[PDB]
Amino acid sequence: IETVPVKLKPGMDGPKVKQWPLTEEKIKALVEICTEMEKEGKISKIGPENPYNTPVFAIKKKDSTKWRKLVDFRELNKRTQDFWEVIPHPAGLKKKKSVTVLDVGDAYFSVPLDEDFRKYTAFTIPSINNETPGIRYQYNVLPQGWKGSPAIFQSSMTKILEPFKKQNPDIVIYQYMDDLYVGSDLEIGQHRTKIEELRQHLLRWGFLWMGYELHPDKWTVQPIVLPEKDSWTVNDIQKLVGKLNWASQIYPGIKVRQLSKLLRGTKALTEVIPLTEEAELELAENREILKEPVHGVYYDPSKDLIAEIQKQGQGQWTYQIYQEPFKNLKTGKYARMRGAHTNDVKQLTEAVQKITTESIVIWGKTPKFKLPIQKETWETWWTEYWQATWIPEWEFVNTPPLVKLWYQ
Amino acid sequence: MVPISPIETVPVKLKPGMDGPKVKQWPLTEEKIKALVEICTEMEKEGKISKIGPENPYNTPVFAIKKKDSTKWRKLVDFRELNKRTQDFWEVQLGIPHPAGLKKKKSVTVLDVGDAYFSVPLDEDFRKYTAFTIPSINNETPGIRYQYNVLPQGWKGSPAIFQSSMTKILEPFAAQNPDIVIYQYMDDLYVGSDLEIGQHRTKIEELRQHLLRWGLTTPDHQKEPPFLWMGYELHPDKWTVQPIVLPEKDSWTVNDIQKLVGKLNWASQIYPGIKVRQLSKLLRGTKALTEVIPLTEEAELELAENREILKEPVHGVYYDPSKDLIAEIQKQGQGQWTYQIYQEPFKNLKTGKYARMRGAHTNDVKQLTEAVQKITTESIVIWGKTPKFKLPIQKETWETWWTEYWQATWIPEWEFVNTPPLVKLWYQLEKEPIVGAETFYVDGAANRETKLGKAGYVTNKGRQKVVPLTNTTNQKTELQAIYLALQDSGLEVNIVTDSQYALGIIQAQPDKSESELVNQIIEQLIKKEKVYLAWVPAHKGIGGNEQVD
Ligand SMILES: Cc1cc2cc(C#N)cn2c(C)c1Nc1ccnc(Nc2ccc(C#N)cc2)n1
Ligand SMILES: [Mg+2]
Ligand SMILES: [Mg+2]
Ligand SMILES: [Mg+2]
Ligand SMILES: [Mg+2]
């Protein structure tokens, strides 16, 4: 009922970010949705005196036929004042057997937005071929996808969930942007019934019926493994030595000398080389070293999380999350086929969403991605496959990395 | 008195921390002053301006200029200073419509809204910032002080506020008449439809009444089809670019060539197959417009081909939303690609071209991919959808390429069209070492100070070479080493290198390069039946030999 005053960071004006081209269907979708939101007082028309803009589009979330408005607030969010409630994030969330993700964004629409800040939420619904003026709007209430919405709504949310939390003490609840992550160790059916209990608990107190079920305890990671062979070729040993050399930037005690002693002399690549005893011992010792965790690996909340993705072919993708080079906080692999078999970019987009979800569960924030794709390709297609209500930061890598080989 | 609805004003502010303009009024001739007094008397009488007291600190210079009309004076207020201090506005004029996206109209009428412009009030609190002074005769009295009540010509916020006010006024009329289109440009409204001319003139009269409700009067027009608009000619059923005339010259300066390339780029959106590369390649590293640059034979041929393409008028048709969109691309060579977008065969909605990005190495498939993305994006802007593509590349070629490429890449729904030259993969490296094929261990090195170096190889059959090189670098010698291995081997070969640079280039799979060395290597690769390239770490005591200093 009362708006909490919001300001941008000192020395910063509001976002001015070009609206990117939208398809006919997304435009129709946004016109319907925004017409209804305007009738509901959630948004108001604005005039030419508002210079600011934030891009908008629409998505179809997991297994639903309804469009959802999605504002890309990344610019506003980095320009928006840091809101300090004076959250550590739960460490137990990732340890729970099942976590269900709920879209709670609708709730935000019940809290009015500070007047003087509203101008900064300006967005445009474009017209095809720019034949009619873009319909301009701003938010009267807490918009979905804005940094300030969960921070502001937090006091309301905690109060809403007091009975559920107090009566379900072992259930771990985390909020990130528009999403509510509810973990528990219960049985999947009982779990679904408790989630339903929570969403009805929400409906009573004010499209949240959906759910996304993750099983964090089943998250596999990826230790470094070396081949076990009866007969090694010159090529096999060369690849092994390459891999071990690469591992030695990570793990201190890696030795290639004895193994290298087999690569002295100029031999056919396919010629089989029996391993010496010193070489087999060196290999065994390396294998031992690789079973231990990496030395000096810590998470620092003040630093960016960085995620790298490699295309391994045949629908397989490898990834690594780290803060500092050769200190990996998490590694993983996706063999997943979800509707993507003929489409690389759909695959990559889904990989990015999954990695971001995992990153939110573990550390409570999103990584900056290094994507193995051309800027123009990604920028052209990623919004077609995007199912998530947040969006991360990304950059592009144009030079093929060698490390692909070593992650499988 | 028929009551008219007021036009709601737009709240306007100066840029934060900035105050209004304070600028000295220029001395003017007695003639100019009398003229300005008369003009401003008329304007004041019409309500456009108002006399203000001594209190207002602000000022903007006023000028009198002999009118475009032979006998008259014209008032020019110079708002540059106020414009500098005026807030940014939303500019709806950005991203102009493309004619190929328009729908054909049976009738298009023009309505002069020039009078409606001055019916638009200026924000009350902002008016003081628009103050100006007519200097008095012989400077012996206080100058006459005025401020604007309406959007001033030349002021920063006038076009956006005019447009938004007009749009707001027209919205209910447009929404309740979906069978017409309305578009505002300058002082004119354009109303198209497919209705019978009677019903059309009817809807026009209805619009004039609707406007009258705000007290906006229209002259009851000079402009008729074809329209000359933003560099085009619009006709009821067709569009084209305004005439493109390539000048005859015995010599060309840098400026001439720039203008030429501009005309060609503008023409390329309708005239198919326009080429700019050989003409643009002259413009690099000049900066002097007057400098005369001799034309290469290739530039002359390009310009001639252009002249041929431009010899007679070509037209695009308009968009029919009920029919699918088709885009077809051809390779022109030298990194140039050209395309056509149509619905019915041989009737183009538009045409266009794509030049390869500036880079060290490239291949045809990447370029085709980029062209596809560009056409996709332009097409979503113009028609709101992706066209079906017809491409000079075999399905199998594309399959092989994207399945083996280290980057994620995608092309939307497309089909092969067999119209040479076809895009192909020129070489394909092996995924596993080759049994029976000789194994070449290559290396190169160079002394950084002397720039002397060596490149070479040793193989499993005892084959060896070391070549001494002058004026070279490590990277060059690594490449040269690989080149030698390719040169001296059979149709199938294994090559072992420690060079991450060379592997970084070759794994990118270029079919062409700036470096002649990489080019020679590519030619060699093309000639091979099977090539396996293996990387090993340097200085680990592997069969790759230094040897090379
Ligand atoms: C009505 C419209 C008129 C108009 C005059 C100018 C100028 N100068 C620029 N215009 C734009 C941009 C419009 N806006 C739209 C919107 C949809 N379809 C068309 N089609 C269409 C077809 C034929 C002609 C002709 N002759 C002119 C437009 N125009
Ligand atoms: Mg798209
Ligand atoms: Mg006196
Ligand atoms: Mg012509
Ligand atoms: Mg070496």
Side-chain angles (χ1 to χ4, degrees), chain A residues 1 3-6 8-38 40-60 63-84 86-96 98-158 160-165 167-189 191-201 203-204 206 208-217 219-408, chain B residues 1-23 25-44 46-65 70-71 73 75-92 95-105 107-200 202-219 221 224-258 260-280 282-286 288-549:
Chain A
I1 186 71
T3 78
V4 28
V6 184
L8 298 164
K9 293 178 182 179
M12 287 183 183
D13 197 23
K16 301 176 164 180
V17 190
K18 292 189 171 184
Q19 177 62 47
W20 63 68
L22 300 182
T23 62
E24 183 175 1
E25 50 171 2
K26 288 182 186 54
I27 289 177
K28 296 187 202 318
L30 290 170
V31 165
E32 295 185 38
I33 293 178
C34 282
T35 293
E36 291 314 299
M37 290 176 75
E38 181 190 357
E40 287 172 311
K42 302 163 160 175
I43 60 175
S44 289
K45 297 283 228 282
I46 56 174
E49 74 279 11
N50 186 326
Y52 306 112
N53 194 62
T54 292
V56 69
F57 63 117
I59 68 178
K60 289 218 191 180
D63 298 273
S64 68
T65 60
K66 200 170 189 59
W67 291 102
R68 183 197 196 277
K69 178 172 161 212
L70 184 41
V71 195
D72 174 18
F73 272 132
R74 285 176 290 175
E75 184 65 27
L76 181 63
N77 282 345
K78 77 186 55 170
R79 274 162 195 250
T80 290
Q81 71 187 21
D82 294 319
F83 277 85
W84 301 129
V86 27
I87 245 64
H89 170 83
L93 182 57
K94 65 176 177 294
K95 300 169 184 291
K96 292 296 165 168
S98 293
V99 180
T100 299
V101 190
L102 300 181
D103 186 9
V104 295
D106 251 279
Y108 292 158
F109 293 155
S110 69
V111 174
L113 181 66
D114 174 32
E115 331 275 0
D116 305 315
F117 200 77
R118 297 186 180 180
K119 66 177 74 72
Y120 298 130
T121 69
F123 65 89
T124 315
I125 305 181
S127 74
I128 301 188
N129 195 27
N130 303 287
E131 290 169 6
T132 62
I135 313 177
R136 295 224 80 204
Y137 288 108
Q138 78 183 9
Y139 269 92
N140 295 327
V141 304
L142 309 181
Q144 297 182 125
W146 177 50
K147 174 168 74 172
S149 289
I152 284 171
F153 191 77
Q154 185 175 50
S155 63
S156 312
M157 179 66 73
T158 44
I160 291 180
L161 296 187
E162 284 291 359
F164 189 91
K165 285 181 58 181
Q167 114 146 358
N168 292 279
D170 296 325
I171 283 183
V172 172
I173 298 179
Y174 176 65
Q175 183 179 12
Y176 180 80
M177 296 297 177
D178 295 13
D179 290 350
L180 212 61
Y181 301 79
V182 190
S184 75
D185 297 289
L186 293 170
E187 187 257 328
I188 174 64
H191 184 85
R192 294 183 202 201
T193 54
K194 294 311 266 63
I195 295 300
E196 185 64 51
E197 166 178 335
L198 186 53
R199 70 182 61 168
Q200 201 76 197
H201 195 283
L203 176 135
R204 156 172 57 257
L208 52 85
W209 59 68
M210 334 194 65
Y212 181 18
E213 45 194 7
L214 327 155
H215 308 290
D217 67 278
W219 291 354
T220 49
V221 316
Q222 278 293 277
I224 303 176
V225 303
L226 310 171
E228 287 181 36
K229 293 190 186 292
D230 293 338
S231 39
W232 300 74
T233 63
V234 166
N235 185 237
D236 289 327
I237 296 186
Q238 290 184 352
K239 297 192 302 180
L240 176 61
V241 163
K243 193 165 183 182
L244 283 171
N245 179 70
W246 167 78
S248 64
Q249 306 170 97
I250 303 177
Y251 291 89
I254 297 301
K255 303 307 170 202
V256 305
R257 319 309 181 282
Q258 300 311 128
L259 285 166
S260 275
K261 287 185 184 182
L262 315 180
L263 300 175
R264 90 214 298 97
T266 104
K267 295 182 172 299
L269 276 189
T270 57
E271 174 167 321
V272 177
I273 306 303
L275 299 182
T276 54
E277 294 291 335
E278 312 87 298
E280 282 175 28
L281 178 68
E282 188 176 75
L283 178 57
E285 290 167 342
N286 290 330
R287 212 186 290 276
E288 281 294 306
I289 289 165
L290 288 185
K291 289 191 297 182
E292 305 173 335
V294 180
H295 193 237
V297 175
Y298 68 106
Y299 172 73
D300 182 349
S302 71
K303 292 176 169 184
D304 291 337
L305 288 162
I306 298 167
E308 290 180 6
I309 302 181
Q310 305 83 213
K311 172 179 171 188
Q312 297 290 0
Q314 298 180 218
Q316 295 198 301
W317 305 79
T318 48
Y319 69 93
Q320 306 77 223
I321 310 173
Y322 64 88
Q323 286 183 323
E324 311 279 341
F326 313 111
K327 308 289 185 188
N328 275 338
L329 291 174
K330 169 153 175 47
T331 67
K333 185 189 181 190
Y334 299 146
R336 349 256 126 275
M337 150 114 201
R338 26 221 61 260
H341 190 245
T342 179
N343 190 335
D344 259 349
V345 177
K346 180 172 187 175
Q347 275 169 52
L348 182 53
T349 304
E350 289 166 346
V352 165
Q353 282 164 90
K354 290 165 56 46
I355 298 165
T356 298
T357 283
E358 295 173 14
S359 174
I360 290 169
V361 170
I362 306 170
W363 307 283
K365 62 188 200 177
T366 76
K368 169 130 189 171
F369 287 83
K370 298 175 71 177
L371 300 181
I373 195 175
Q374 263 203 61
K375 176 179 175 189
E376 290 75 22
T377 305
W378 176 257
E379 282 191 339
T380 302
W381 300 109
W382 69 266
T383 59
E384 286 296 314
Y385 318 116
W386 200 259
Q387 236 92 294
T389 68
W390 29 255
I391 317 173
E393 306 284 353
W394 43 63
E395 53 187 54
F396 307 102
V397 18
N398 308 117
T399 300
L402 206 36
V403 290
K404 160 192 166 179
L405 312 180
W406 300 320
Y407 279 119
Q408 272 158 293
Chain B
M1 169 59 166
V2 190
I4 66 185
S5 305
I7 299 173
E8 66 163 53
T9 63
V10 173
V12 184
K13 289 187 284 79
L14 296 174
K15 298 177 169 180
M18 287 187 183
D19 195 14
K22 298 162 174 178
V23 178
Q25 171 58 48
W26 295 86
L28 294 180
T29 73
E30 186 175 336
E31 183 179 17
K32 288 181 177 177
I33 292 180
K34 284 172 193 171
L36 281 181
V37 165
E38 203 165 25
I39 292 175
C40 295
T41 306
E42 168 80 303
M43 294 189 55
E44 177 187 12
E46 286 168 340
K48 303 181 178 189
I49 60 182
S50 296
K51 276 184 185 174
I52 56 168
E55 302 79 12
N56 191 318
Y58 306 107
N59 196 63
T60 288
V62 67
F63 283 86
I65 294 188
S70 42
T71 345
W73 281 100
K75 179 177 96 303
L76 174 129
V77 187
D78 167 40
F79 278 118
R80 294 196 305 247
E81 188 58 32
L82 176 55
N83 290 348
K84 290 185 191 190
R85 297 138 179 276
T86 292
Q87 65 163 88
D88 298 320
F89 292 93
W90 191 246
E91 299 289 333
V92 74
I96 92 163
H98 197 286
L102 305 174
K103 272 60 61 182
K104 66 171 167 195
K105 299 297 166 205
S107 346
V108 178
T109 312
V110 188
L111 285 158
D112 174 20
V113 293
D115 287 318
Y117 180 92
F118 296 95
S119 240
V120 181
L122 181 55
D123 185 37
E124 169 55 31
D125 293 336
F126 198 87
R127 298 184 184 189
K128 58 178 175 179
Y129 299 133
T130 62
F132 65 97
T133 318
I134 310 185
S136 73
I137 307 281
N138 292 324
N139 310 316
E140 292 181 340
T141 41
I144 306 187
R145 290 278 288 164
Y146 282 107
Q147 80 181 2
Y148 271 89
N149 309 314
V150 299
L151 308 178
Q153 279 263 275
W155 178 54
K156 188 187 178 180
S158 289
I161 291 173
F162 180 50
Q163 279 188 91
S164 81
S165 308
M166 202 56 42
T167 291
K168 185 167 190 166
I169 282 164
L170 298 165
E171 269 183 357
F173 190 88
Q176 289 171 231
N177 287 317
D179 54 30
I180 73 176
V181 290
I182 313 170
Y183 167 76
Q184 180 196 358
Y185 181 69
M186 306 304 191
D187 281 356
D188 300 274
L189 280 190
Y190 299 83
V191 194
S193 77
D194 291 321
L195 298 165
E196 319 290 342
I197 192 179
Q199 299 182 90
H200 180 88
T202 288
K203 296 265 191 172
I204 301 299
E205 288 314 309
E206 298 189 341
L207 174 52
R208 297 188 65 213
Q209 167 178 354
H210 184 82
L211 282 189
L212 261 188
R213 289 159 104 234
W214 285 269
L216 305 188
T217 44
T218 67
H221 201 286
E224 43 188 32
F227 301 105
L228 312 181
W229 176 83
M230 301 275 80
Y232 309 94
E233 302 184 0
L234 309 179
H235 301 257
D237 58 345
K238 65 177 180 292
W239 72 275
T240 186
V241 288
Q242 281 177 47
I244 306 284
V245 192
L246 303 188
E248 310 286 348
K249 274 182 170 60
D250 290 85
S251 75
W252 309 79
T253 81
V254 165
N255 187 244
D256 291 330
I257 300 181
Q258 293 179 358
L260 178 57
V261 172
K263 281 194 178 63
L264 291 169
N265 287 343
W266 188 250
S268 64
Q269 67 187 304
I270 193 48
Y271 294 87
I274 296 289
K275 306 168 188 176
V276 296
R277 193 227 179 188
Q278 305 300 328
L279 293 164
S280 302
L282 311 182
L283 289 189
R284 36 204 189 87
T286 58
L289 300 206
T290 33
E291 178 188 351
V292 166
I293 297 187
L295 262 66
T296 58
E297 184 181 352
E298 3 284 337
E300 218 70 54
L301 190 53
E302 191 177 78
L303 173 51
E305 298 169 359
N306 288 333
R307 289 192 176 279
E308 191 57 33
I309 293 167
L310 293 177
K311 80 165 183 173
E312 47 187 10
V314 175
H315 292 87
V317 296
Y318 289 128
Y319 179 60
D320 174 19
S322 63
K323 293 179 177 180
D324 227 83
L325 219 47
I326 296 154
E328 191 171 338
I329 306 174
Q330 301 87 29
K331 172 185 178 185
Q332 312 177 282
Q334 297 81 54
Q336 294 170 113
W337 303 72
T338 193
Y339 65 91
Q340 305 85 40
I341 305 176
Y342 64 88
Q343 305 191 284
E344 291 293 318
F346 304 116
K347 303 170 177 175
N348 290 344
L349 274 66
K350 79 187 294 295
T351 64
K353 56 179 177 48
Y354 177 73
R356 92 189 136 197
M357 295 178 76
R358 204 160 275 278
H361 328 278
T362 192
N363 78 20
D364 279 357
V365 182
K366 292 175 187 188
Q367 291 184 31
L368 179 55
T369 300
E370 293 157 3
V372 160
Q373 311 309 154
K374 162 184 184 170
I375 293 159
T376 293
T377 299
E378 156 171 277
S379 295
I380 295 173
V381 175
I382 303 180
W383 305 285
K385 69 192 202 196
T386 308
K388 288 176 177 174
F389 284 93
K390 289 182 184 173
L391 308 180
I393 185 180
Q394 304 260 219
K395 288 281 178 177
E396 184 172 358
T397 300
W398 173 253
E399 162 108 323
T400 298
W401 162 260
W402 82 259
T403 39
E404 300 302 327
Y405 194 44
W406 74 272
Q407 278 189 339
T409 181
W410 157 261
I411 277 178
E413 162 175 355
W414 73 276
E415 61 179 40
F416 171 59
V417 51
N418 186 357
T419 58
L422 300 190
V423 175
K424 57 181 284 190
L425 292 174
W426 291 94
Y427 58 86
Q428 211 185 326
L429 305 178
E430 297 297 304
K431 309 165 187 167
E432 298 297 324
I434 307 156
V435 173
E438 189 172 0
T439 289
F440 286 63
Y441 297 86
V442 304
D443 206 339
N447 179 277
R448 196 170 172 79
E449 300 290 286
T450 64
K451 291 154 289 181
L452 300 170
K454 297 167 175 187
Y457 62 73
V458 297
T459 86
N460 58 304
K461 291 170 90 172
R463 196 190 312 268
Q464 283 190 12
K465 173 178 294 193
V466 183
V467 180
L469 299 167
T470 63
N471 194 39
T472 191
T473 57
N474 285 334
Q475 293 180 174
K476 271 200 180 183
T477 61
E478 293 162 3
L479 288 174
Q480 181 74 29
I482 291 185
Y483 182 48
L484 291 168
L486 290 167
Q487 263 182 134
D488 299 351
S489 51
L491 296 171
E492 303 191 350
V493 58
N494 303 296
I495 299 177
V496 182
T497 182
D498 65 35
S499 171
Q500 301 171 50
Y501 163 79
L503 189 82
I505 287 178
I506 293 179
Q507 290 194 314
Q509 309 199 62
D511 57 28
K512 253 187 178 185
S513 182
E514 310 260 58
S515 161
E516 190 211 357
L517 188 43
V518 184
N519 265 275
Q520 289 161 308
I521 285 175
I522 292 163
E523 188 175 24
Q524 288 302 134
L525 290 176
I526 291 173
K527 299 188 175 185
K528 297 299 181 181
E529 287 303 293
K530 292 190 175 181
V531 173
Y532 178 69
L533 191 54
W535 176 89
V536 295
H539 304 322
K540 288 306 176 184
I542 303 185
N545 266 339
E546 311 147 340
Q547 198 103 112
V548 167
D549 293 39

